[PDB]
């Protein structure tokens, strides 16, 4: 996260770290959506242009974390993966359309002050909140700058951007399964996701019921925190039927 700040303790108790076993390193962010299911970006698991194709046994899920590198004894919980499900129409070839994946844990994780699931939006909450100017919050342990690394989880609040501005910022074909967020050059404030934040959540706090909803998944950008560029996020509600199909089936 570029131009963010240290998270408060327990601020994002749904935040998950995807951790590579060998070599031991941060792979991506992710989020906890129930005691057995974790949501992330498909490109965290499958991205052939970078020779990325992880299997269940390559990875661990670390939940309840704050420190990036420390083993947070008695706080974090480490889970193994039972199964990965990648969206069948995930478009890694072109533009990362439908950049979404689910991971089922081998065993349920116990909730605590530091571990708690985020809500997924329904149509109404999405309609109300996914509007240009409305701000969400992005969290992760990725790089502090495009070209270093944080001691603890970082957080930044960013406004959703009008779709024409998103489109006009890039040569990539944007789809309805994406939205973009970030400040414009003239707005002064800044901030963005960056390498390592992939797969983490873009959340909004509903003013109707005071619950946090995951509206987006950190997907792609052009550099990090560049003037005139924006971060692009998977539109979770637009892909919720798939999410529900997977959870209902498996």
């Amino acid at each position: 996260i570029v131009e963010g700040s240290d998270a408060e303790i327990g601020m994002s108790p749904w935040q998950v770290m995807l951790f590579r076993k060998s070599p031991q390193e941060l792979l991506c962010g992710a989020s906890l959506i129930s005691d057995r299911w974790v949501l992330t970006a498909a490109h965290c698991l499958l991205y052939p242009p970078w020779d990325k194709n992880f299997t269940e046994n390559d990875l661990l899920v670390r939940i309840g974390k704050h420190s990036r590198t420390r083993y947070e004894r008695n706080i974090e919980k480490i889970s193994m993966l039972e199964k990965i499900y990648i969206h069948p129409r995930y478009n890694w070839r072109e533009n990362l359309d439908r950049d979404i994946a689910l991971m089922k844990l081998k065993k349920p994780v116990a909730f605590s002050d530091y571990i708690h699931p985020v809500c997924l939006p329904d149509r109404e909450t999405a309609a109300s909140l996914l509007q240009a100017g409305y701000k969400g919050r992005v969290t992760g342990w990725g790089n502090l700058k495009e070209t270093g690394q944080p001691s603890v989880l970082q957080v930044v609040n960013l406004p959703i951007v009008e779709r024409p501005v998103c489109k006009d910022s890039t040569r990539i074909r944007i789809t309805d399964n994406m939205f973009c967020a970030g400040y414009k050059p003239d707005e002064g404030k800044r901030g963005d996701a960056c390498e390592g934040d992939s797969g983490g959540p873009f959340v909004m706090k509903s003013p109707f019921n005071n619950r946090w909803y995951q509206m987006g998944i950190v997907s792609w950008g052009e550099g990090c925190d560049r003037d005139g560029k924006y971060g692009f996020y998977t539109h979770v509600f637009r892909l919720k039927k798939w999410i529900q199909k997977v959870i209902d089936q498996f």
Binding site: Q24, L60, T69, Y71, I78, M80
Partner: peptide
């Protein structure tokens, strides 16, 4: 740069 995690998690 990462602190070792318990062996049980393999």
């Amino acid at each position: 740069d990462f602190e070792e995690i318990p062996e049980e998690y393999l």
